[PDB]
Amino acid sequence: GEILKELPEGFDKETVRKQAMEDIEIAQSKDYESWKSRFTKDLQSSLTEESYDSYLKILEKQGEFKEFGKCTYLGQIKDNKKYGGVIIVVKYEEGNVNYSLAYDEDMNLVSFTM
Template sequence: MMKKRYGWKLLVLAALMALLAVGCSKSSKLPDGFTEEGVKTQAEADIKLAESNDFEGWKARFAASLQSSITEDVYQPYLDMLAKKGDFESFGKTAFVGQEKDGQKYAAVIYVVKYAEGEIKYTVGYDEDMKLVQFVAQ
């Protein structure tokens, strides 16, 4: 139990650091090479993949440099939260943010998803290859 809590806290800490980096650097519209529709469509697919309990498939969606930090101990608390929210109902509101840092381009969407017993706010970020660099569910 303690190990699971530590893994979840580590993921939240990494997400907060990523959000802080976005907040501290130049951000606005999506950088060249990204479209809102493309980011939105990929985020929907990645959220559905995460919901499917396919840990290996979901992990494979992350950038190679991040995959070693994605463990089942990090994934399980998400599944537990999802179980409490009930069945998927619909994708809701979105907001987009882009960033260019050290010559790399990133795009993220904040997506509110409705479930039978409430909502989850996802922050899903991508690199230029549309690999996940951030996946936070609150």
């Protein structure tokens, strides 16, 4: 379906900003199956360690997380399923890594990028 640039009906700006903040900080500390628990149960089998290994190569020269900056919100549809996203800036000590965390209404992450 359509992949919106914003939250349509069935989501919340406060809840969606928060459901990304956590997910970032669980990725930071190289959590494997604790970070899988953020994704869909299907995606827990689809996750790579490369998703938190190549990621670490970026992170290691960004500094430590200081604050969450500007948060864009996003939408998606699969067929009948609606999905809520967020491009939430992270002010690391040296880098803005603007993590894009998109998930279903059931609240299981479906599309994490940075």
